[model samples]
Target: KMARKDPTIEFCQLGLDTFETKYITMFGMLVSCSFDKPAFISFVFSDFTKNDIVQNYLYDRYLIDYENKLELNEGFKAIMYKNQFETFDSKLRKIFNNGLRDLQNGRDENLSQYGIVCKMNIKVKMYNGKLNAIVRECEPVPHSQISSIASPSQCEHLRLFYQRAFKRIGESAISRYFEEYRRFFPI
Candidate 1:
């Protein structure tokens, strides 16, 4: 029989097996949401542990779908910009369809804010040796409930995320939007 479900894991637990097993559930301090003009979107997160295979990696080929033919979502561009240091990717499908449009136009319903923590079910894979996390499902693990997480690996991930991310957005310049944020805010 097929495995009932992929295990909920932490960033520290992701390894080469992730590429074969294909899906995982993890936590994220979604530090970024970005759009590359048209036909591309991405979410970058950190649970404050090691997946040493990662970087604030960029030039990632985020979207390459067979379907094509829509234009006029600078609104999404605007909204994605509002959610810096937040996890809009979790509430992403709230008003949308599949992952494509879900990401392309995800910041619709609410403005997810920082000190933000998320319980995420995602798919992890690699592109030219860089690790990437994709959202399959996302939900809140709000500060008040943060300590209630019971997994060994993720428990530490939660603790470390709290130490590093909880209100310590000291590096966040207008939301720490990763490359763009790092690019524009490098001072």
Candidate 2:
């Protein structure tokens, strides 16, 4: 008769050997080892991939730093200007104009009699299968003599309108008649 051997004992030994080798290699040394219930459960539950760790580090290092620079340099104002150009909806413009009217009448606390002007350097480019508009620089609109149309609120409103009008021009589609004429003319 042959003696029966339990496979569970062999499996447990194999698991222990693998862990012992890994722990020593990873830590460079081993102090003591114990499979405590709480510690073992926590070890199993704690999960993070290498990619997740790398992405978190990169986001903190790059994106956080970039945002801090923008705040310090007033770059957020330029971003808002760009967003206005991109969305240029007529309904939004009407709402913005109403807000400006309120500001001019001192009903808005956000604007003061000392008007603010914004000078933006903008560019339009065709790239990557789309039109791209960018604001390269922004500064307070240069000081000039006061005119009826030149209040701070009005200047801001005008800038908003200029961008929206430009956007509309870019979005206009060619008429079918014009397309047919171009096809015949070949110029």
For model 1, the superposed segments whose C-alpha errors exceed 4 Å read: 1-4, 17-19, 36-40, 54-56, 59-113, 127-132, 147-160, 163-187
| Model 2 quality (TM-score) | 0.18
- Compared with the true structure, model 1 gives a TM-score of 0.47
* Per-residue accuracy of model 1 over 1-187 as CA lDDT, tens digit each: 3544667754556543433547667665444455553443455554345444543333222121112211111001111232421344435333222322333345532222333456656655665655545565555454434557445655666666555543344434324444322322243
Q: Tens-digit lDDT track for model 2 on 10-123? A: 111212221121110000000111122332210000001011111111111111112221111111111223334324223223423432223334332222111223333333
Task: Name the regions of candidate 2 deviating beyond 4 angstroms.
Answer: 1-117, 142-187
lDDT of 1: 0.43
Cα RMSD (Å) per model? 12.4, 29.4
Worst 10 residues of 1 by lDDT: 69-78
Worst 10 residues of 2 by lDDT: 23-32
